[model samples]
Each structure stands twice: as C-alpha cells, then as structure tokens.
Target chain A: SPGIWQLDCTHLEGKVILVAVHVASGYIEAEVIPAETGQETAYFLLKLAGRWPVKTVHTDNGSNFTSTTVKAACWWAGIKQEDGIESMNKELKKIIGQVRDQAEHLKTAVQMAVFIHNHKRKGYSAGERIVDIIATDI
Target chain B: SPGIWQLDCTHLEGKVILVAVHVASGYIEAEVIPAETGQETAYFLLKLAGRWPVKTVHTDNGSNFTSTTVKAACWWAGIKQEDGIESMNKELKKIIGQVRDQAEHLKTAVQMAVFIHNHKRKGYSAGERIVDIIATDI
Candidate 1:
C-alpha cells in the first residue's frame, strides 16, 4: 500500500517555529525552531530519525524542506523526497473536515486526525493497514 | 457590515500560486511562488496595499506566511499580521461540514469555505464593525 505523511507547522507564543510530521503508523514527531530554514529542517530530520526509519519523506516543497541543507540532510539520510500530495491533503481535510472554532478544537481535531489516519484508514493498494505499511516495510 | 478577505492557492504548470481576498472590500491579498516557498508572502502584502488599505491581516502561521519575506513585507507595508488564526481554519471546516466518502468534495469544500469567509458572514468585535476597528483612525 502507498504510505502517506502529513507535515504542518505549529505556533507558540506569537511565533511560528515548529514542524510536525505524522507517518501512517501514527508515529508523530515535532521540532521547535527559531525559523523555518534548511538548518532547522535538518535538525528536525535528525531528531525524527532517532525514533523512526524514514524511507520516503513527502512535503509540499516549502523552503524549509527544499533548502540546500534539507536536501543535503536527505542525501545523507538516503531518503527519497517527493512532492505533490494534494490528494493526501484532500483526504486529511475530508477526514478531519473542519472546525468551527480552531482555537477551541484544533488540538482535539489534530488528535482525531491522527487517530483516523492510523486506525481507521484502509489504504488503496489492496486494503493493507496503513500503520503496518508505515511502521514495518511490507 | 465588516470586511473580510479570503485567501487560497492554485497551482500553474510553472508555479503554485494562491490568490484570495475579499470580493467587495479586498482587505487581504497573498501570492505564493513555487507556490510553496512561503516567499511570495511579500507579494501578498504588496497587493494588499495596492488593492485595499489593510490594517490587520490574519492567517495561520504556515511557513508561507511566517517566513522572513512575509514578515518584512508586512513591516514595510505597515500592516499588522496576526497569527493563531487556526480559528479561521476551523471556521472553514465547520462550513464545509462533512464529506462522507467523496474525495473530490475537498476542493469544493475549501472553495465554499473561502466564499463564506469573504461574504455571508459578520465579524464580532466590541460592538464596532471589525473592518472599522481595523481601518478606522485610532
């Protein structure tokens, strides 16, 4: 089955500095940074690898991910990076739907999204488990 | 009545771009290049100034808007940019509501959310029109 990863940023104290990535396995990791730059992204990737073996990383080609440093990091990690996952974004949107008051429900909504992605989803390629496909190569 | 700006993106063959603002008052404007760099944020502010006098621009702290280019653009434009508009994201969700099994509905849902944000809605702020509160002389 094809695996999906959802990446996004989180804000803290009037600043935008964190990046979070959620793999199909329900494995989640985040990094706090001073800016969204290649160096910061490299740090994130390094930290992320400590917990999970990232084979294919997908992103929307933001500078943070497309930076030379990020490219270098991926090269070092031997990871394949791909872009254009609009369908995944759409899938997430459909599952999580919308929040009437994000300030009120964002945390819970994100949590729910994670739950659905890991447990409820049936992947396209032969109905394999997304979590199994992501956490363990099959 | 209060004025609202709606922002969205579209990908062309060459670049991934987004264009959204109020249909009537056009209070906010944003453009993205590679449609992903979060660099085109500067262009958004420049257009905001050209189209409408913006006092406050609100958005989620996505890298696209939080990047230095956007910050500098806002500073140069002398418009205040607000983070923590996850509520706006939430509002979009609520209006879009639920999508049972259809995936293509995602696009329509987002577009509908933008429509609601720009029109058919009123904002609340200390008994004064939100547009006036932001635009009026302090």
Candidate 2:
C-alpha cells in the first residue's frame, strides 16, 4: 500500500494528494487532502477498504504512515503492515505525476490511465478477463 | 525495446513527449522529437547500445512497430526481432510513470529506480561486484 502525496508538502500551499494502491490489481484510490499528516493519511487508507478491501500494508519509511493515527486506522481497518508494500510507490508516482497539476483534472487523468492500463487484452491481467494470458492462449 | 511516445506530434498541439524504454534494465531515452517514425525510434534504440548494447529487441504487435520501416530498422540495426516483449511494457509503464513528468528529472529518477531494481543483494548480478555482496565472502 502506497500513497500519492507530495513527499514533503510541509511548506507549500493548497490541497495536495494522498493515494492508496492495491498490490495485485494495481488499483489506485487518491484524494486531494489538506496536507501530509498521519490523520489525513489514515483517512486516506481507511476509505480504500470500501472498494478493494486491502489488508496488511507494505511498510515503508514515512513519518505520516508510521504515525499513531495512521497505525490506528490500519488496526481498525484490520490491515496488516507488510514488508514489500513500499514497492507500490514506484507505480504511484508514475501514474499520479500525470495529473499532479490539477486535483480535479487528476481524478479524470488517473481514471483514464487506469482504464488504459487495466484494459489489457493480451498479457497477464490482474483485472480478470482471463486467469493468465499465456502466449498459447493469445 | 518499446517506447512510450505520443501517437502524434504534428497532429497534436502540445509538444508531447515520446520516450523509448529499455526493458533489460528499465532505462529510458527520450526527446521532443517531432514524430514517432520508425527511423527516429531506431535512432533511439541504437544509442541505447552505446550504454547498454542492443542485440535483440523485445517486441509485440502494434501499428508503428509492425511497419515496414520499423522492421527494416530492426534488420539494419542487427537487432533481433522479438516476441513477448510487450509484456515488458507493463512493468515499464509501472516504473516509468513516475519519471515521465520531467525528462531531466526522469534521467535521475529512472537511474535511481533502475539501480535500486538491479541491486538485488541476494539473487543475481552480472559480476560488477565480487560475485555477491555477502559480507562473509568478502
């Protein structure tokens, strides 16, 4: 589980983004929240459960993610703090950067990217058109 | 050998960025090149050889990639045409999405991502180190 927010939005202004990503499906859920903080991040993670049902966050070295509120949200959401979840950030930045300039615009851009990305007819898909799109099947 | 380039330059308004990506190690080469022609693409590919050497191309079907010129470039450059290379695009997109916004930024970001990716301390390496990073071995 990784988020889309300024790495450090402490000094800047305006509502920034926070994101949650699913591992296998590569799904993203981002919100333009006020700032980068533990409570805001927890709010971010908790909402993801309604849709993708995540458990066990891949732990990384981030202060907001390590905060008591964020951890509490994880506890309430029944999510574990897993090890490799940090790898999701690499993906988060790529897709999120496309819409970093506009929050409302980003929502549309991200949705479009996800659609294009998930609409793979050829290869191995996590979105479930087929189990595994092997070469023979293609 | 796949490039994430805008489909058109002249047909489009903004100076869209077309990027060529190396699947071998997640390296990217890009330019504000006016068009997405086969020769331009091959130019991108051959240069990658200077740093990493391109003997084979990992490719799958698409419009431009299947063109006669593209195939000829594949022939002329002594690059072995490949199948199943498109799958690498997914991984590339996942990684490349982060570094896309700034080409100058991407050079550093992609380099870091690739370095971190290739630096698996346990599994494998091409002998840059003393076979392994095991403290006991040293």
Candidate 3:
C-alpha cells in the first residue's frame, strides 16, 4: 500500500479534507473540505484501522495538521507523520503545466487528468489492488 | 490613444511575454524574453522609450527583475517599478470558480473566460487626461 491521506484544509461541511493512501496498494481516498479539527482527522484514522493497520501518514505543513489537537490525535492513534515528500506537488504541477502549455482546451484537459489520476492510476506498491483500496472505505 | 510597447529580452530566444497597457492614455507594454540579463533589459527599455514615455512599471519580485542591472536600467529610463502582486491569482480564481459551478463542459467554459479576459477587457484609471496630454511626451 502506498499510503492514504488528505490534502488542503479539511473543513468542507465538517467532513475533513483528506486523501487516504494504502502504502502497499497505492490506493487513494480524496475528500475536499471535510472538517476543521483533529477530531475529524481522528475519525478518519479510526475508519482506516477498522480495515487495515496504518503505520505512517504524510501531509503538508498546514496549521490544521500540526496543531496540538492533531498531534494528540495522531499520538493516540500511533501513526507517525513523515517529512520531506509533498504528495500534492504532483497534482499541482500537473494542473499548472496543463494550463500554461495546453492553453487551447486547458480546462477540459485538466479535468480529464484529475479523473485519470483518481480512478485509473495503479499503485506500484499495492499490485492490482489500487481500486480495491479506494472501494474499501469509499 | 495608449501606445502598447512590447519588450523583448536579448538573451532568451523566441520567448514572447505579452504585456498590454496604455502609455499616453496610461502605461501598457509587453516584453519577450530574449535573454534574461541586465544588458538585455536595458536594450528593451531603450526600445520602449523610443515608442513612448514610461511613467510607471510593474513586475513580480523575480531575481531577473530585481537584479542591480534591471534596477539601474529602470532608473535611467525614469520608470518606477512596483512589485508584490501575484499577477495570475485573479484570473486563476475566476477560472476555478467557473469550472466548479458548471461541472459539465467546464473546459470550454474556462477557455472562453480566458479568451474574453485577454481580448475584450477595458482598462480604467483614476487620473484625468486632456487631448493635449495625449499628444505631448511625458
């Protein structure tokens, strides 16, 4: 499994913004604007544990992820947050590049790219279970 | 009528960045990247001045714009450079908003929006200008 987590601020309707990755399977779970607090983050973690053990988590240096509430939640959950790798960079770069270079029909192309990344990308680590990982909790 | 001048960098080849503004009516010019250096910037300024008098200039805080060479070139040309605004933010937000609302045919909608922004937008300013002001060199 590659690992699952969310990106951006999670406060969309209290659901919590998250992208869940299955480290061994390379499965992705993405939710935009989910929740604002660590309690919401904890809920997602609990859900993950019900399916499989999550050993590590990775995210950007946003205050929501680094706050005392989130720290306590992660500590209680026993999942360690990693440093250095920015998961969103890949997606961001792709979007910007598409807009800058393919100016003729950029909006359509960008949407297509996002769709492909979410549903079609196979996880290198999880073998053929990328879709399976997303289906598990989605 | 505002004179639109296009600035070209001497170092980089075929890099044409379009900047449009009204000079006598206001200030507008476009610069192409030929070479990203002081001498090139100076040359572009000289050519620009040949077409119109520059009262104010705006650029992002790029090292190429802030280098001592570029500063001296602007000073000699009597053009003041204003920095700090992220040029792409306004337009990008508009595109995102449009795409999110009309999920279907979003690509076409975004492309149409950008087209209208570039070709059909009018510029406005706070200052008053007389007919003679348009004819006389500043």
Candidate 4:
C-alpha cells in the first residue's frame, strides 16, 4: 500500500500539533493533541491507520514515536515503521505556520491548512499528479 | 482516465441537488444549484473539474446536460461526455435522504453527507479503493 512518510510535531498557543504528510500525493493528516505523550500519539496513529490504508510509516525519531506503546500501536495497525526525511517537513511547517497566523481556532486552522494543501490546482495537484501517474502507467 | 459515471439530480427543500459519483472510488461531488439550467450545470461542472482531474463525464439526459452551453463547458474542460447509470443513484439518494433528515442547515448537511460518504472505513473507503487500485497496477 502507498503511505505517508514524514511525521513531525510543532507547538503553538500552548497546543501541540501532530502532523504527517503523504509523500506521493502531498496530502496532509494533522491533529491538535491535548498532551504530547506516546500514549496520545499511539491513539492518534491508530486512528489515522483506521481512516486510511496506511501500510508503512517513515517517521521521526522523537521520543513520543519511539516508545514501546507507540511501537505496539503500529504493529497492531499492520504498519511498518522506519526513519524519515526533512524536505516535506519544511513544506509542512511552512503551511502550518501560515495557517496558524490566520487566527482561527487551532483545530479549524489546522484542517483549513490541510484542505488548502490538498486542493491546490494552479498546476498539477497532488491528487491530479497521482491520477496522471496512474493513467500514464495504463 | 477512470471517471465518475453517474450524474443525477434531486429536489429537496425546494433546492436542486446535483450529484456525481466516481465509479472506481465511489467518491461523490455534489452541489445545490440555484436553477436547473445548462448555465448553472456548466458552472458547477467547471468548478468540479477545477477541483479534480475530471477527464470524462457520464451524465443524465436532462435538458441541463444536453444544452449547448453545458456541452461547451465540458469541451472547455477537456471532458468527454457520455450516458449514465442509476444504481449509484439509489445509494446516493438514500444517503442524501438520511442526511437531510438530520435537519442541519442545507449546505452543511450536504457537505457532512459528502464527508461521511468519503470516509467510510470499516472496509475500504473510496479513497482507499482508488489507492489500492493504483497500487495493484504497480
């Protein structure tokens, strides 16, 4: 299965934002976490796996993701975990920063950012590019 | 390219809900048009094409779809138009009815219906199915 690889976290307004990026499509999955613990992160990762067909995770080395509980959660979800990259991290951070400056509720802002990121259509969108690639192979 | 093959419209609360379903993924694109005219339908179709890579359309035979203005719009978007089906029509109408009965504001209700339709994850989602199909070829 295709997967999202880059996982990163940031803090704003005393709230923690956990974010991941689907590399092939540039789609984003993000949430505002109440606490930045391995338990909360495991719960979030499990929920993400439930929502999408996530098979492999290329992730950060942050202690929150390296914990045994988070490892078990990945195992339970049938997700393979590995190390990560930083380029998408920069792009993802840029969008989050821009969204955070919009002054909406934190959760609403994060979702709006995800929507904006996913739907960019000036040229080839992440979705459009993926579809074109699929069509190209056919 | 694989495309949405079912386009249908229904009247609810005196508003017209125009709907289309992507066949491979079962994803939905819907809008409440003010008038059932080719002009309105053309605008809606262009907006949809802008939001996604819609290369072909399978549509109903209503005047709204048959008019020259609508034909020109599809041409402008490089979309090939064809005839349609009704099974997805039944399933879509059932969801719209279930959503309408929830009694929220009309637009919000429609969008919530779209979200629910796209995110069904007890099994493969529309997004999941598409990704799986894409992966299968690889």
Candidate 5:
C-alpha cells in the first residue's frame, strides 16, 4: 500500500503535465512535458520510482500509459501496472487554474499549486500522514 | 448522464459540510450540516435534485449513506443508489482550507470553494458544458 501510485496526464495552458499521486497519502508529483508518449511517460514514471518507493502504477487506458515502453520501465523498476484508474485531472486543473491567473510564470504556478495541495493540513496531509505512520511504527 | 451525482461529507473548521458533485459535468453543491445523518444527507440530496435533474446518487458505505432514510429518499425521488465511491472529500477539504483561512465566515468560504470548483474554466466547466449540450440538442 505504501508503494502504490496513480499516474495520469492533464493539459494546462497548452502544456502537457504528467502527474503522479501516491494513493495512500494523496501526495502528488507533477512535471510538464513537451508531449505525452511512451518514452516521455516512462521516463517520468522511472524518475518518480527512483525518488519514491513506487511499487505499482495505476492509470487510465491512455496509449502513453499502455505503451510497451512504460511496461518495460515498470518491469525494470520492479513495479506492477494497473490498467484502469477517474483521473484526478479535474481536481489538479482547478488548483492550477486559480494559481495560473495570479502567477506570472505558468510553471511556477503549477509548482505552487502542487505545494499547496501536498501541504494542505485540512485533513492531515500526505507529509503528516507519512510521518505519523513512521512515528507510530517506531 | 446529466443527473448522475456523487455525495459525501467533510469536516472543516469543526463543521460537517455535505457535498454533491455532478459526475459528468463536475459541478458541485455543498452545504454545512450540523451532523452527518441520513435525514441531513437525504435533505441535501433532495434539495440538489430539486434544483437539478438528479437520476442517480453514489456514495461510500457510511451509515448515513446506507441508512433506510436515504434509501427511502432515493426511492421517492426515482434516483438509483450506488454504494462504494472514493470520496472527493480531500479535494473539497483542500479548497475549504484555503478559503477558510482568508474568509470571515466558514459557510461563505465553503460556498466560495464550490463556486470556484464549478466555475473553473481550465478544461471547460459544468456551466459551459450544460449550455453547450443544450445548444447542440436544439
């Protein structure tokens, strides 16, 4: 459960944003890409796995997600893939829309949106939950 | 597709906020409730249906959702019920958290969040889609 993740893509201001959400903690990682393709998607997945303990990736049946390149990337990373997953696309889009209107740089707005999302303490955030789990385990 | 709705509750600023989302259009309606009970949830659902054409309601298996009171309400309204839905609670909570910190009234903040969420133009919105659907139908 700790290593489970959901990945999807959303377009903002004509740029493709590849998104990864930690299913347990609702922690998110997003990066802008020139295109959404097997190579691009797989690279992003691998990068997330490298930084986080990503064991399984779940996504909608988008071609980029279903491509063999992503399959191979998961195979190499010892991660499993789940083919079907409602995107959190709309939720992130709403956040980005608010930040984009005020911020000068689109990328900066996206980052700010993610930061606000991840640090939200309304329901005890991903960071807080992760630390709580670790603390309780110890 | 127009009337399919998802309902759930989130606690914000020591208040229970009942929320409903139109599945197809992502339009949202939220109200502050004194408690999360079948009566409260049912009243909220009925109100939403009165304003919009609600054909179905889906929710998690919380007691209030599964209660006979809610079932009767759905039955009377000709709305089918679908049990087991992942909450949009976290998304709404994040929105409320930001608005609550800045707004004078918690209820006003909640209403503002729902307005921002429903009116978001990032990927086309519920209002826009509804108008588009009507225009195309004609």
Candidate 6:
C-alpha cells in the first residue's frame, strides 16, 4: 500500500538487466550491468533515490542485492527494504521474452518495448507520442 | 530507403548496450554488452535474423557492425548487408533519461514506460496498467 515495488533481473542472450516496478506510479526502470556487483547495485539504487524517490523496496533474496553496499545505499536513501515478499520479474520476463535471444540491434527496440507499455498505456496515444519505432524485417 | 532502417548504440553509466529499430514493424530491441565488438554486433544481428527475420542492414561506419564477424553472420543468416544511417539508440537515451540514473528497484518502472508507449497506443488505456510503481518518489 505504501511505497512498495518488486525488483529483479532478466537475462537475455547472456546479458542481465535490472528491472524495478514502482507499485503506485506504474513506472518501470531497467538498467544494464555486466554483473550485479554490490557497487553496481548501490549505484542503481542511488540513481533510483535521486530520481524516483523510493521510500520502500521489495525484492527477492540475492547476494548482489542483499550485500552491504546495496543495503547501505538503500538505507542512506531512506528507502525501506523487503525481501522474498513478492517476485514479479516473471511477468516482466514474459514481456521481455518476446524479444529474448533478440538481435543485438534490437536494443532500443527492447527498451522501447518496455516503455510503450507505460506511455502508450490504456487506450492512450500519448505514449506513442513519446517515441516511434520502425521495423526492418527480412 | 523505405526499409533501410538505421542502427546504433549508446553508453550509459560506463556500460554500452545495443539498440535497433524496425522501420516497418515499429519494433525496437535493446541489449547490454561488454562492448560493441564486431562479434557482439554480429551476435545481436543474428538474434534479429532469427526471430525478427532481418535482412539488408544499414549502419554507420562502425567496425563493430561492419566487421568481418558481423558480415559473416549476416551472410550466413542470409541477411544481406549494407552501410550508413543511425541513432535508434540515441532515442532510447531520452526514454532512459526519463528514469535518469534510476534505482536498483526501478527496473519494472523503466520497462512499463516502454510498454505503455505501445499497448496503450491511440486506443491505449490509462497507461497506468504497469503492475506497480509507488516508490517513484520520496
């Protein structure tokens, strides 16, 4: 009910990107990392703190996230923490799955794939206004 | 030049990822990579060749996209090759900018932003269908 969200990672073609879903705003943020290191996690969390202003966090039990650095970043940011309560990365996986094993050229496409889900939302053309993608198929 | 879609990459937080646009289908894909190596570009192009079925590529004079490895893969995949034209990724930077340095838990929020841009097209809905994003603010 309060500030809550489900965060996790999705591996595509050998790369893993972090995904976080804001419970109240329906906003989503995805980041790419070579690996989920403590520093990386902290950096991202801090990014979240600066922009999204998260007060609470929810995620599964993972070393990278549970590490001291990640926790500290969350703590300093004043964002609460929740572990193993919910894991919605699965649903995201489905959406992301559509482009899984995707071509390297599909980077923006995938990123946009996730964004349109937010901007072009619920019968609104506003989302499309944010961006436009043209496909080049064989 | 109708189907002559362009391609490019963007570096973020010191990490470089792939981004491509489908000029016809309006599909976009994003990928995280150790670097934009020719092999990496080839790998992603192959990924597109498989699912998205891409052929006849147009890209800037980047060695990575034009390298032997990338060309070989396209050749093998029966995907023709061309050169010149770009920035499907620069665009992603803006959407990415919206989240700007996001939080570790902001992944979901980032993704939905892309989805609403599509599902919620002209007939799109509230664009609020994102699973959740309450923690977007302090």
RMSD, one per candidate, in order = 21.4, 18.0, 22.0, 9.9, 19.7, 12.2
lDDT of 2 by residue, A59-113 (tens): 4446755688778766755666544334444454464565456333443444433
Identify the candidate with maximal TM-score: 4
Q: Give the distance in Å from residue B132's predicted Cα in candidate 5 to where it truly belongs.
A: 51
| Clash total of candidate 2 | 5
* Tens-digit per-residue lDDT, A26-120, candidate 3: 43333333245565554444334322334566644466466665565456455675542155546634543654453333332333233334334
Predicted structure with the largest lDDT when compared to the true one: 5
Estimated TM-score per prediction? 0.32, 0.34, 0.29, 0.50, 0.45, 0.41
Model 3 chain B scores worst on lDDT over the 10 consecutive residues at: B124-133
Pairs with backbone N, CA or C atoms under 3 Å apart (clashes), candidate 5: none
Candidate 6 lDDT at A136 equals 9
Those runs of model 2 whose alpha carbons end farther than 4 Å from true positions after fitting are: A1-16, A82-104, A121-124, A129-138, B1-138
Scoring only the A-chain of each prediction against the true A-chain gives TM-scores of 0.54, 0.56, 0.47, 0.76, 0.83, 0.68
**Ten contiguous residues minimizing lDDT sum, candidate 3 chain A:** A7-16
DockQ values of all predictions: 0.01, 0.01, 0.01, 0.07, 0.01, 0.05
lDDT of each: 0.45, 0.42, 0.41, 0.64, 0.66, 0.52
Candidate 1: stretches off by over 4 Å: A1-4, A85-138, B1-138
**Fraction of native Cα-Cα interface contacts (under 8 Å, chains A and B) also present in model 5:** 0.00
Q: Give lDDT: candidate 6, residue B107.
A: 35
CAPRI-style quality class for the chain A–B interface of candidate 6: incorrect
Interface alpha-carbon RMSD, every candidate = 23.1, 20.6, 27.5, 8.5, 22.0, 15.5
lDDT of 5 at B84: 59
Task: Report fnat, model 1.
Answer: 0.00
The TM-score-based order of candidates, best leading, equals: 4, 5, 6, 2, 1, 3
